[PDB]
């Protein structure tokens, strides 16, 4: 409910019993599945304003291209 990227999800799976209590500490490779899970299309970085690879400034949703202050338009 807290996740703003829909990254963390609770799956319909319950068989998680273990022999050692230390083996119930799941690291990132034990959690990161290879697909989108319950939310199949949401991409936070498609909405965020911060620039990453493949998505420059002004390429997010509802964003205009940046206008330089040196531009000739009034």
């Amino acid at each position: 409910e807290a996740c703003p990227t829909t990254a963390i999800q609770l799956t319909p799976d319950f068989e998680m019993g273990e022999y050692k209590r230390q083996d119930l500490v799941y690291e990132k490779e034990d959690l990161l599945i290879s697909g989108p899970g319950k939310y199949p299309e949401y991409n936070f970085y498609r909405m965020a304003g911060m620039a990453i690879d493949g998505k420059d400034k002004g390429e997010a949703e509802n964003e205009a291209k940046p206008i330089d202050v040196k531009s000739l338009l009034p």
Binding site: K70, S71, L72, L73, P74
Partner: protein, 156 residues
């Protein structure tokens, strides 16, 4: 690199004589550089800052604040058509469409050969004679879309 000429520096100093603060000649120094070079390049900001004794951030803020100080390269002639309300009533849209069709550019852009740069401007104070358009030094009034090619031809 950039270097102010002697004439530019003399004009800037003579403008500095007219005010009790040398900062007050920043607009006129930018306009002097713009008259001599068509626009204000990047080194001109630091040169004017060194002459006036004010930070380059202040000169850059003045240069980017005012619309008629060009911080990007322009063409040989700056077409400035009035897009304000009285010229809107008098139909500047025909003038803008004629200029776009003749020059094959969008407003704010420059032609391939650097001849004209198309810009909308504010009200030119000639509303009773609209639509008006100010090329480099001359204001042209009572404009019609069929008189645009005959008016642009005299500006080589």
């Amino acid at each position: 690199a950039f270097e102010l000429s002697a004439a530019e520096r003399e004009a800037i100093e003579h403008e500095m004589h007219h005010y009790e603060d040398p900062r007050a000649a920043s607009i006129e120094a930018l306009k002097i550089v713009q008259k001599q070079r068509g626009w204000v390049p990047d080194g001109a900001i630091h040169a004017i800052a060194d002459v006036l004794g004010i930070p380059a951030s202040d000169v850059e803020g003045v240069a980017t604040f005012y619309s008629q100080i060009f911080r990007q390269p322009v063409g040989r002639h700056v077409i400035r058509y009035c897009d304000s309300v009285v010229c809107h009533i008098n139909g500047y849209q025909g003038i803008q469409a004629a200029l776009e069709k003749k020059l094959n550019i969008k407003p704010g852009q420059t032609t391939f050969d650097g001849r004209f740069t198309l810009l909308p401007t504010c009200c030119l104070g000639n509303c009773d004679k609209g639509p008006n358009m100010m090329i480099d030094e001359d204001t042209h009034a009572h404009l019609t879309p069929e008189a645009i090619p005959e008016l642009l031809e005299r500006y080589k």
